[PDB]
Write an enzyme that holds these catalytic residues in place. Structure first.
Site, PDB file in Angstrom:
ATOM      1  N   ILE A   1       0.837  -1.204   0.000  1.00  0.00           N
ATOM      2  CA  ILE A   1       0.000   0.000   0.000  1.00  0.00           C
ATOM      3  C   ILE A   1       0.875   1.260   0.000  1.00  0.00           C
ATOM      4  CG2 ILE A   1      -1.646   1.425   1.330  1.00  0.00           C
ATOM      5  CD1 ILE A   1      -3.083  -1.095   2.180  1.00  0.00           C
TER       6      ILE A   1
ATOM      7  N   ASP B   1       1.000  16.397  14.091  1.00  0.00           N
ATOM      8  CA  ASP B   1       1.431  16.023  12.749  1.00  0.00           C
ATOM      9  C   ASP B   1       0.271  15.705  11.799  1.00  0.00           C
ATOM     10  OD1 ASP B   1       3.412  15.745  10.791  1.00  0.00           O
ATOM     11  OD2 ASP B   1       3.666  13.606  11.179  1.00  0.00           O
TER      12      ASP B   1
END
Lengths: 340, 8
Positions: free
Chosen positions: A21, A139
């Protein structure tokens, strides 16, 4: 054991049918099939043990994710590692399969207002829970927002997360594009920094491009000033660091770019909320609960279905000082609950 | 909620 793109995944026999992925600095993520629960999962192979900071971020991620339980935050379903600490070189984190993320999605298609609204709602719903636990994510960015085919959104990667309870982001190698102005002005620990990041994400959903793509701390700040214009004297007076205040004061005046010019095809209610999130003064910046109650999100807003954490999150140890050997011991202990 | 996503 099945190999993916030149990396051994020792997750069998339970987990098979592996396909790449994505990947990070010290990890690779794959879709997989879980032969026990007869369901498709995601498995993340992490190899952090030769690097002290990788260990810290890994430990923080594991502890936080195991404690948190919210529909809009990725959970940890299982952890695979070796029966003995010396043998443990890799850690396999098994999670719900999320086919894509917002970063990849925005590279491939333009989002309808309906999708932008629903995605924003889920981001803020997840963030309400994070903030209620007295945690700052720090983040938030499109690649940290996981998506599936049915438009479910889950926040991931708490590697840089902190508790707001008395570490500098400018000391880490990470994307700076979603960082609040106060961070570059050298200040990094109110909930308001996360709201700024969400505002940057909203802007990105509206145009398919990062609003403030700075290459270093001064460039990042200048990108923000380019759009918001020079801060008012009032907002300058709220900057506690005099050097930073006088630096901003000294720059040539810049007029604000109106939001409807930047985003000419955006919903007017979306831009009103954008404005309140991308507010220079952190004290004046909209809070998560106030954001959920904003008219843009009226379709989805339901405070009785927007759960909070029942207790503040706390780290039992200061992780930043610890040698990587000790951090490994702590990762071993934390993953023990998934061992037979 | 909006319709499903065609992922590429």
């Amino acid at each position: 054991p099945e190999m993916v793109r030149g990396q051994v995944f020792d997750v069998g026999p339970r987990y098979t049918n592996l396909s790449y992925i994505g990947e990070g600095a010290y990890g690779m993520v794959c879709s997989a099939y879980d032969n026990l629960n007869k369901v498709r999962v995601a498995i993340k192979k992490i190899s952090p043990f030769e690097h002290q900071t990788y260990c810290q971020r890994t430990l923080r991620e594991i502890k936080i994710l195991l404690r948190f339980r919210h529909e809009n935050i990725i959970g940890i379903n299982d952890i695979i590692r070796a029966p003995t600490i010396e043998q443990m070189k890799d850690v396999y984190i098994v999670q719900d399969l999320m086919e894509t993320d917002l970063y990849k999605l925005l590279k491939t298609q333009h989002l309808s207002n309906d999708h932008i609204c629903y995605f924003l709602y889920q981001i803020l719903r997840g963030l309400k829970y994070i903030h209620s636990a007295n945690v700052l994510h720090r983040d938030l960015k499109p690649s940290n927002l996981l998506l599936n085919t049915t438009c479910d959104l889950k926040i991931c990667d708490f590697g840089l997360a902190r508790v707001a309870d008395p570490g500098f982001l400018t000391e880490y190698v990470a994307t700076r594009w979603y960082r609040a102005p106060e961070i570059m002005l050298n200040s990094g620990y109110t909930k308001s920094i996360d709201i700024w990041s969400v505002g940057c994400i909203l802007a990105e959903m509206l145009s398919n491009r990062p609003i403030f793509p700075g290459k270093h701390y001064l460039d990042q700040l200048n990108h923000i000033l380019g759009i918001l214009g020079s801060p008012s004297q009032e907002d300058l007076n709220c900057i506690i660091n005099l050097k930073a205040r006088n630096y901003l004061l000294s720059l040539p005046h810049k007029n604000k770019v109106p939001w409807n010019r930047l985003f000419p095809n955006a919903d007017s209610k979306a831009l009103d909320l954008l404005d309140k999130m991308l507010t220079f003064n952190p004290h004046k910046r909209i809070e998560v609960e106030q954001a959920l109650a904003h008219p843009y999100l009226e379709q989805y807003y339901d405070p009785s279905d927007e759960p909070i954490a029942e207790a503040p999150f706390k780290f039992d140890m200061e992780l930043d000082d610890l040698p990587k050997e000790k951090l490994k011991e702590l990762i071993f202990e934390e993953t023990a609950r998934f061992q037979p | 909620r909006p319709p499903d996503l065609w992922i590429h």
